[PDB]
Design an enzyme around this catalytic site. Sequence first.
Site, PDB file in Angstrom:
ATOM      1  N   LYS A  40       1.101  -0.938  -0.197  1.00  0.00           N
ATOM      2  CA  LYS A  40       0.327   0.408   0.092  1.00  0.00           C
ATOM      3  C   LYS A  40       1.344   1.391  -0.029  1.00  0.00           C
ATOM      4  O   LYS A  40       1.672   0.845   0.884  1.00  0.00           O
ATOM      5  CB  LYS A  40      -1.236   0.340   1.134  1.00  0.00           C
ATOM      6  CG  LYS A  40      -2.342  -0.475   1.241  1.00  0.00           C
ATOM      7  CD  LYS A  40      -2.931  -0.319   2.178  1.00  0.00           C
ATOM      8  CE  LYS A  40      -4.257  -0.716   2.608  1.00  0.00           C
ATOM      9  NZ  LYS A  40      -5.043  -0.514   1.465  1.00  0.00           N
ATOM     10  N   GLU A  86       0.158  -9.268   3.223  1.00  0.00           N
ATOM     11  CA  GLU A  86       0.093 -10.522   2.582  1.00  0.00           C
ATOM     12  C   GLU A  86      -0.842 -10.094   1.374  1.00  0.00           C
ATOM     13  O   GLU A  86      -1.383 -10.088   1.235  1.00  0.00           O
ATOM     14  CB  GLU A  86      -0.450 -11.330   4.169  1.00  0.00           C
ATOM     15  CG  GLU A  86      -1.562 -12.695   2.765  1.00  0.00           C
ATOM     16  CD  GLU A  86      -2.458 -13.580   3.511  1.00  0.00           C
ATOM     17  OE1 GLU A  86      -2.635 -12.191   4.456  1.00  0.00           O
ATOM     18  OE2 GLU A  86      -2.872 -14.330   3.312  1.00  0.00           O
ATOM     19  N   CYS A  88      -3.641 -11.683  -1.571  1.00  0.00           N
ATOM     20  CA  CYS A  88      -4.341 -12.595  -1.848  1.00  0.00           C
ATOM     21  C   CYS A  88      -4.548 -12.295  -3.338  1.00  0.00           C
ATOM     22  O   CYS A  88      -4.960 -11.649  -3.595  1.00  0.00           O
ATOM     23  CB  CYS A  88      -5.554 -11.970  -0.851  1.00  0.00           C
ATOM     24  SG  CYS A  88      -5.380 -11.945   0.632  1.00  0.00           S
ATOM     25  N   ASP A 132     -16.819  -2.018  10.024  1.00  0.00           N
ATOM     26  CA  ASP A 132     -17.155  -2.321   8.225  1.00  0.00           C
ATOM     27  C   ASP A 132     -16.896  -3.921   8.103  1.00  0.00           C
ATOM     28  O   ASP A 132     -16.424  -4.181   6.619  1.00  0.00           O
ATOM     29  CB  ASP A 132     -16.516  -1.993   7.523  1.00  0.00           C
ATOM     30  CG  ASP A 132     -17.104  -1.472   6.315  1.00  0.00           C
ATOM     31  OD1 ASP A 132     -16.339  -0.493   5.167  1.00  0.00           O
ATOM     32  OD2 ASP A 132     -18.307  -1.799   6.163  1.00  0.00           O
ATOM     33  N   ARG A 136     -16.655  -6.206   0.477  1.00  0.00           N
ATOM     34  CA  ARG A 136     -16.408  -5.746  -0.548  1.00  0.00           C
ATOM     35  C   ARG A 136     -14.780  -5.424   0.226  1.00  0.00           C
ATOM     36  O   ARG A 136     -14.030  -4.642   0.461  1.00  0.00           O
ATOM     37  CB  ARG A 136     -16.852  -4.577  -0.119  1.00  0.00           C
ATOM     38  CG  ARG A 136     -16.321  -2.955   0.460  1.00  0.00           C
ATOM     39  CD  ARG A 136     -16.869  -1.447   0.274  1.00  0.00           C
ATOM     40  NE  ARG A 136     -15.687  -1.200  -0.161  1.00  0.00           N
ATOM     41  CZ  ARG A 136     -14.542  -0.528   0.444  1.00  0.00           C
ATOM     42  NH1 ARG A 136     -14.507  -0.687   1.563  1.00  0.00           N
ATOM     43  NH2 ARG A 136     -13.819   0.402  -0.131  1.00  0.00           N
ATOM     44  N   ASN A 137     -15.139  -5.465   1.874  1.00  0.00           N
ATOM     45  CA  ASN A 137     -13.887  -5.525   2.805  1.00  0.00           C
ATOM     46  C   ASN A 137     -12.848  -6.781   2.455  1.00  0.00           C
ATOM     47  O   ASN A 137     -11.834  -7.212   3.066  1.00  0.00           O
ATOM     48  CB  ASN A 137     -14.436  -5.067   4.297  1.00  0.00           C
ATOM     49  CG  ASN A 137     -14.209  -4.043   3.369  1.00  0.00           C
ATOM     50  OD1 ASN A 137     -13.507  -2.462   3.292  1.00  0.00           O
ATOM     51  ND2 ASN A 137     -15.407  -2.970   4.395  1.00  0.00           N
ATOM     52  N   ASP A 150      -9.432  -4.162   5.179  1.00  0.00           N
ATOM     53  CA  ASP A 150      -9.825  -3.190   5.986  1.00  0.00           C
ATOM     54  C   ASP A 150     -10.187  -2.614   7.381  1.00  0.00           C
ATOM     55  O   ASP A 150     -11.063  -2.441   7.668  1.00  0.00           O
ATOM     56  CB  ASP A 150     -11.152  -3.118   4.773  1.00  0.00           C
ATOM     57  CG  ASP A 150     -11.539  -1.008   4.740  1.00  0.00           C
ATOM     58  OD1 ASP A 150     -10.596  -0.585   4.602  1.00  0.00           O
ATOM     59  OD2 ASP A 150     -12.650  -0.879   4.832  1.00  0.00           O
TER      60      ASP A 150
HETATM   61  C1  LIG Z   1      -8.023  -4.821  -6.170  1.00  0.00           C
HETATM   62  O1  LIG Z   1      -8.737  -5.846  -5.631  1.00  0.00           O
HETATM   63  C2  LIG Z   1      -6.985  -6.697  -5.981  1.00  0.00           C
HETATM   64  C3  LIG Z   1      -6.441  -6.480  -4.730  1.00  0.00           C
HETATM   65  C4  LIG Z   1      -5.387  -8.310  -4.421  1.00  0.00           C
HETATM   66  N1  LIG Z   1      -4.698  -8.279  -3.989  1.00  0.00           N
HETATM   67  C5  LIG Z   1      -4.933  -8.085  -2.816  1.00  0.00           C
HETATM   68  N2  LIG Z   1      -4.395  -9.231  -1.770  1.00  0.00           N
HETATM   69  C6  LIG Z   1      -3.331  -7.659  -0.524  1.00  0.00           C
HETATM   70  C7  LIG Z   1      -4.113  -6.123  -0.477  1.00  0.00           C
HETATM   71  C8  LIG Z   1      -3.798  -6.118   0.858  1.00  0.00           C
HETATM   72  C9  LIG Z   1      -4.970  -4.263   0.439  1.00  0.00           C
HETATM   73  N3  LIG Z   1      -5.334  -4.959  -1.133  1.00  0.00           N
HETATM   74  C10 LIG Z   1      -5.884  -3.757  -1.478  1.00  0.00           C
HETATM   75  C11 LIG Z   1      -6.529  -3.390  -3.475  1.00  0.00           C
HETATM   76  C12 LIG Z   1      -6.143  -2.787  -3.488  1.00  0.00           C
HETATM   77  C13 LIG Z   1      -6.779  -0.884  -2.681  1.00  0.00           C
HETATM   78  C14 LIG Z   1      -6.682  -1.548  -1.776  1.00  0.00           C
HETATM   79  N4  LIG Z   1      -6.552  -2.182  -0.698  1.00  0.00           N
HETATM   80  C15 LIG Z   1      -5.203  -6.179  -1.058  1.00  0.00           C
HETATM   81  N5  LIG Z   1      -5.135  -6.641  -2.189  1.00  0.00           N
HETATM   82  C16 LIG Z   1      -4.894  -8.668  -6.000  1.00  0.00           C
HETATM   83  C17 LIG Z   1      -5.871  -7.974  -7.206  1.00  0.00           C
HETATM   84  O2  LIG Z   1      -5.689  -8.688  -8.473  1.00  0.00           O
HETATM   85  C18 LIG Z   1      -6.477 -10.073  -8.505  1.00  0.00           C
HETATM   86  C19 LIG Z   1      -7.065  -7.287  -7.095  1.00  0.00           C
HETATM   87  O3  LIG Z   1      -8.050  -6.771  -8.170  1.00  0.00           O
HETATM   88  C20 LIG Z   1      -8.188  -7.889  -8.598  1.00  0.00           C
END
Ligand SMILES: COc1cc(Nc2ncc3ccn(-c4ccccn4)c3n2)cc(OC)c1OC
Length: 262
Positions: A40, A86, A88, A132, A136-137, A150
Amino acid sequence: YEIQRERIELGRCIGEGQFGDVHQGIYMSPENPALAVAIKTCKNCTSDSVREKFLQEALTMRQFDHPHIVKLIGVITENPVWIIMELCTLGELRSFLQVRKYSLDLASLILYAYQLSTALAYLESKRFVHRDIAARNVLVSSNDCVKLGDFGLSRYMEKLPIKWMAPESINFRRFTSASDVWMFGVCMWEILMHGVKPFQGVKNNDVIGRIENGERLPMPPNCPPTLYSLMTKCWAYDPSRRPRFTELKAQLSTILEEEKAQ
Ligand SMILES: COc1cc(Nc2ncc3ccn(-c4ccccn4)c3n2)cc(OC)c1OC
């Protein structure tokens, strides 16, 4: 958990956060395997203000360790300020669900609800109130592994998730383990609705008066009535009448095994 940019590799932007873009990437410590991670970033962090609000999310997450709760892995507190956590791989639960609607079985839906209830049962045992809980979270780690995120509560800065919130939260800003149960109830509903939002097409102000009327989100098509009956309990207007997570977690297990062997 201080890290060093020297071991981090910025990759594709994965979305915009409340403070900056979020990039996926990898962290690599020598004789240690490289691990995927989300980074982030925070563009306005040279501002003390903005930084405190941004890093707060990491302080919070630093207290948890559960298989179904996005894990903190480090932070680069110097500048530009980054929070490493981490990864995801499959993204947000809402998209994943909308895209795999006609491909995910019912048991997987209930399993996600169950895994989330375990993460929440854990936070309730630490007397932590999230505030929350919403699809979405939730981030997806694999086809059978969902995680909660979140903790920075992106939707409460400055957007008010009226349609997820417990009545007492809207009306009195009261957030307790019990309101988290009300939200988890809506989140279960979303999961079963394949990522469709609650009360879409209804003005907030209107949703509020409807709840007080006793109206509740309808039963999701193909939702086992047992599951909907469990959501209906999470939505008791009187917060004290709502179940706690040790119980949601036990009933979801049951209901999951029943949808499994059937
Ligand atoms: C934005 O959603 C995604 C998150 C992830 N992975 C992920 N893993 C850890 C975190 C931590 C925060 N977020 C995240 C993503 C976008 C906006 C704010 N936090 C995270 N998102 C991977 C994606 O690519 C497939 C992805 O797009 C669909």
